[PDB]
Write an enzyme that holds these catalytic residues in place. Structure first.
Site, PDB file in Angstrom:
ATOM      1  N   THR A   1     -15.166 -19.334 -33.720  1.00 26.44           N
ATOM      2  CA  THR A   1     -15.725 -18.197 -33.732  1.00 26.44           C
ATOM      3  C   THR A   1     -16.058 -17.504 -32.320  1.00 26.44           C
ATOM      4  O   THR A   1     -15.365 -16.371 -31.374  1.00 26.44           O
ATOM      5  CB  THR A   1     -16.322 -17.456 -34.847  1.00 26.44           C
ATOM      6  OG1 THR A   1     -17.409 -18.146 -34.987  1.00 26.44           O
ATOM      7  CG2 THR A   1     -15.548 -16.823 -35.950  1.00 26.44           C
TER       8      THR A   1
ATOM      9  N   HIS B   1     -10.602  -7.533 -23.665  1.00 23.69           N
ATOM     10  CA  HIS B   1     -10.619  -7.618 -25.011  1.00 23.69           C
ATOM     11  C   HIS B   1     -11.904  -6.955 -25.631  1.00 23.69           C
ATOM     12  O   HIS B   1     -11.670  -5.953 -26.325  1.00 23.69           O
ATOM     13  CB  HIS B   1     -10.807  -9.190 -25.384  1.00 23.69           C
ATOM     14  CG  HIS B   1     -10.871  -9.539 -26.834  1.00 23.69           C
ATOM     15  ND1 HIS B   1      -9.929  -9.203 -27.768  1.00 23.69           N
ATOM     16  CD2 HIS B   1     -12.010 -10.007 -27.601  1.00 23.69           C
ATOM     17  CE1 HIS B   1     -10.318  -9.401 -28.942  1.00 23.69           C
ATOM     18  NE2 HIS B   1     -11.720  -9.832 -28.902  1.00 23.69           N
TER      19      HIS B   1
ATOM     20  N   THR C   1     -19.235  -7.483 -28.441  1.00 22.94           N
ATOM     21  CA  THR C   1     -20.230  -8.643 -28.816  1.00 22.94           C
ATOM     22  C   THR C   1     -21.073  -9.158 -27.706  1.00 22.94           C
ATOM     23  O   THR C   1     -20.579  -9.408 -26.599  1.00 22.94           O
ATOM     24  CB  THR C   1     -19.285  -9.781 -29.663  1.00 22.94           C
ATOM     25  OG1 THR C   1     -18.629 -10.310 -28.669  1.00 22.94           O
ATOM     26  CG2 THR C   1     -18.580  -9.191 -30.932  1.00 22.94           C
ATOM     27  N   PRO C   2     -22.263  -9.554 -28.024  1.00 26.91           N
ATOM     28  CA  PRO C   2     -23.295  -9.962 -26.843  1.00 26.91           C
ATOM     29  C   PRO C   2     -22.389 -11.349 -26.138  1.00 26.91           C
ATOM     30  O   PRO C   2     -22.075 -11.294 -25.096  1.00 26.91           O
ATOM     31  CB  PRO C   2     -24.432 -10.415 -27.640  1.00 26.91           C
ATOM     32  CG  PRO C   2     -24.575  -9.579 -28.844  1.00 26.91           C
ATOM     33  CD  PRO C   2     -23.035  -8.987 -29.102  1.00 26.91           C
ATOM     34  N   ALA C   3     -22.168 -12.427 -27.004  1.00 27.41           N
ATOM     35  CA  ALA C   3     -21.611 -13.676 -26.085  1.00 27.41           C
ATOM     36  C   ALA C   3     -19.969 -13.156 -25.854  1.00 27.41           C
ATOM     37  O   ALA C   3     -19.639 -13.756 -24.772  1.00 27.41           O
ATOM     38  CB  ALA C   3     -21.696 -14.708 -27.336  1.00 27.41           C
TER      39      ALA C   3
ATOM     40  N   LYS D   1     -11.886  -0.220 -26.818  1.00 23.03           N
ATOM     41  CA  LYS D   1     -12.373  -0.559 -27.968  1.00 23.03           C
ATOM     42  C   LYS D   1     -13.619   0.237 -28.345  1.00 23.03           C
ATOM     43  O   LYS D   1     -14.214   0.425 -29.291  1.00 23.03           O
ATOM     44  CB  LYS D   1     -12.715  -1.934 -28.323  1.00 23.03           C
ATOM     45  CG  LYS D   1     -11.193  -2.928 -28.357  1.00 23.03           C
ATOM     46  CD  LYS D   1     -11.881  -4.336 -29.095  1.00 23.03           C
ATOM     47  CE  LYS D   1     -10.679  -5.307 -29.462  1.00 23.03           C
ATOM     48  NZ  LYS D   1      -9.531  -5.255 -28.398  1.00 23.03           N
TER      49      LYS D   1
ATOM     50  N   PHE E   1     -10.202 -15.148 -32.532  1.00 25.49           N
ATOM     51  CA  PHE E   1     -10.945 -15.930 -33.542  1.00 25.49           C
ATOM     52  C   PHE E   1      -9.918 -17.172 -33.549  1.00 25.49           C
ATOM     53  O   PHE E   1      -8.757 -17.165 -33.530  1.00 25.49           O
ATOM     54  CB  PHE E   1     -11.027 -15.571 -34.852  1.00 25.49           C
ATOM     55  CG  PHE E   1     -11.843 -14.039 -34.861  1.00 25.49           C
ATOM     56  CD1 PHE E   1     -12.736 -14.012 -34.381  1.00 25.49           C
ATOM     57  CD2 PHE E   1     -11.339 -13.219 -35.843  1.00 25.49           C
ATOM     58  CE1 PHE E   1     -13.537 -12.710 -34.423  1.00 25.49           C
ATOM     59  CE2 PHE E   1     -11.639 -12.002 -35.868  1.00 25.49           C
ATOM     60  CZ  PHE E   1     -12.993 -11.785 -35.063  1.00 25.49           C
TER      61      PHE E   1
END
Lengths: 411, 411
Positions: free
Chosen positions: B269, B302, B306-308, B334, B399
């Site tokens: 993930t 993308h 998300t943090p990471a 997004k 993913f």
């Protein structure tokens, strides 16, 4: 002009947990079909399927990871590992980048979908596993494999139902030839023998209900056919560029030379009585290989054991071959194996390949009484031996009228 | 040397039910995110999503057929129809054979899967709908479209989660260039805003929980980011060979010139803090187009919030651009639209295309307080106007570490 050859094989099927075992059982005409016993089939019209017996991944997948993956993903990883091992390929830092994956499934994680859904119904969003998505989605076999072997090249997953194995393999090959990769593990995995899979295809009336004789249920082209039989498993091939293979001195099972795709554009499930879709796909693969229909010794049919289905396919074979109608060998290993959906075209490309190696062709078992005016040689009950077969053709004609065909060449 | 251009567009998104409406709303920075109301979200940690408002297919799909298809399939058909209509393409008997489809979805029919599964739990295999399979499976949009327009050329469906739209479009293009087709409708459709989709991504903790301010939840590259926001919709492009387009005199929005794929080979993930996977994919698309990183005016990230995730992507942009780090425009639609999973790369290829037409670039809204050492221009709050942009790059990093990148060229 980059050429693509096959140098690795892996497989789990209803008649064996390795490539050779599976292959031996098929030339011997053994059926892999048995009664289902992992769920209560009392209410089910179909109570049998082609299951994988004694599946073990203990030494391959840590039970800590198994919890994060549906059975189809586990089957796929294992067959993937076999394929990689059998290939002898060593992944280096300068290697990674050029080695990828094209692996799909038609339906994916039905089992873990039902489980998670059951948990949500009984206990709400909390019972849902944090691994729900990655444990069920179709691309997670390519996902886990690339990580396992540090593969960094192009990575895709084709999901075209029945035609997945063929599509994935053919695009893995297009990828290589194009220049995008040197090595690709391609194939499909499937495990739809669940309540949702058995009841769902049963709701469509697409399945055989011959519970008295499960091994006799899958009978393609026979008069008493009453639907297909479900099969679980996975087929994986290691595809690779000709020179990259030689330069490394690796076994070379055969060469992938043609790949054709078409669409019926008729009905969501039924094929045209015509067989127009299938013809086009076989025809494009020939044109793609640059050979004629007469140069093909064996055709591994889609042949699912459906009234309308087997007839469309025969019609198309007659249409593309003409004179060669009976001179060519056509058989459906689905007679012993059942329909592996997303993995069907994968395992069958492997049979198509092995047939070339061994000059032996597997039979269409259960073909007691053929159909009306069939003029074709469906290798009726026993494996046929062949002399100078150089090309084999593999067919998959799936739901949504999506068709594909692969052509393999000797040495 | 067959060239591929874009001549048809179709779309349903959280900020509009047409291409132009959607596009206008995005340049205006409107958010499509609202609280979910089609299911009880009391137990749900995330109670909002990017929904399609007032979806209508009454005149397009007979309510007799609607019953046979999940919402994602309905969204896909509609956007498919828009794309075909906008293209002006007329399908002839001598045409069919050369016109196909490459349409996928990341998760497919969650809604009808839950429904059928609920029915089986309460009433057994009988409550299961005879349309279960064909109403849920990922390839049924390409399935229905080919039938609707009598398309008979190659037909595939890529299912690579977040990267599906980009993969499908890029392989539709490889197909055409290769010679397999002249026209291809490519894209993705998704409708995962269900209990299973919301609770499932929630079980993974991948989603934002900012229910007090749903429109502020999706905030890529911001310090207070806490996961992605789910978006429903579909994006469809009509791709076609240059001469076949001219010969017919059709609008030509732009030209598809590069396509690159890679794999992280890190985690199921999480992306590498590194951003190595993404770099490779952007790098291969450049090499494929035959241009340099400096020749790119806009990158549709993308950027999922998300943090990471946002950090890996920035790292990769810095890595592939170097000096051009701030000279290039990078934004994530997004921020207004949410994550469309399988359709994300489809809608975003369309924004990437429209940006070229209009020389306008959509903003990354909600970017109140950037991250640590980001040197990049993320088009922070309002749409930027541009002068001589000729190429745009579109990114999807999904993913399973599967990444892709498309490069579009002006006129």
């Amino acid at each position: 002009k980059r050429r693509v050859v096959v140098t690795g094989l892996g497989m789990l099927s209803p008649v064996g947990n390795t490539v050779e075992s599976t292959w031996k059982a098929l030339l011997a005409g053994q059926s892999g079909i048995s009664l289902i016993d992992h769920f209560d089939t009392s209410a089910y019209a179909t109570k049998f399927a082609g299951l994988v017996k004694d599946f073990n991944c203990e030494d391959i997948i840590s039970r800590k990871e198994q919890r994060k993956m549906d059975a189809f993903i586990q089957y796929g990883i294992v067959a993937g590992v076999q394929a990689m091992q059998d290939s002898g390929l060593e992944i280096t830092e300068e290697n990674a980048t050029r080695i990828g994956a094209a692996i799909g499934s038609g339906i994916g994680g039905l089992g873990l979908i039902e489980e998670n859904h059951t948990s949500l119904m009984n206990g709400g969003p909390r019972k849902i596993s944090p691994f729900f998505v990655p444990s069920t989605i179709v691309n997670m076999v390519a996902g886990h494999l690339t990580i396992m072997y540090g593969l960094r090249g192009p990575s895709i997953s084709i999901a075209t139902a029945c035609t997945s194995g063929v599509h994935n393999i053919g695009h893995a090959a297009r990828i290589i030839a194009y220049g995008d990769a040197d090595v690709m593990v391609a194939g499909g995995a499937e495990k739809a023998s669940t309540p949702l899979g058995v009841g769902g295809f049963g709701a469509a009336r697409a399945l055989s209900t011959r519970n008295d004789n499960p091994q006799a249920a899958s009978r393609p082209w026979d008069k008493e056919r009453d639907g297909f039989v479900l099969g679980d498993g996975a087929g994986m091939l290691v595809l690779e560029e000709y020179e990259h293979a030689k330069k490394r001195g690796a076994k070379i099972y055969a060469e992938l030379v043609g790949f054709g795709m078409s669409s019926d554009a008729y009905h969501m499930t039924s094929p045209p009585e015509n067989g127009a879709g299938a013809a086009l796909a076989m025809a494009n693969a020939l044109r793609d290989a640059g050979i004629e229909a007469s140069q093909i010794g064996y055709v591994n049919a889609h042949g699912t054991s459906t009234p309308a289905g087997d007839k469309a396919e025969a019609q198309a074979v007659k249409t593309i071959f003409g004179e060669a109608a009976s001179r060519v060998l056509v058989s459906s290993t689905k007679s012993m194996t059942g329909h592996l959906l997303g993995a069907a075209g994968a395992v069958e490309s492997i049979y198509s390949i092995l047939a070339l190696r061994d000059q032996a062709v597997p039979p269409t078992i259960n073909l007691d009484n053929p159909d009306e005016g069939c003029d074709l040689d469906f290798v009726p009950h026993e494996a046929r031996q062949v002399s100078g077969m150089e090309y084999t053709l593999c067919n998959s004609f799936g739901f949504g009228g999506t068709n594909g065909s692969l052509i393999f060449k000797k040495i």
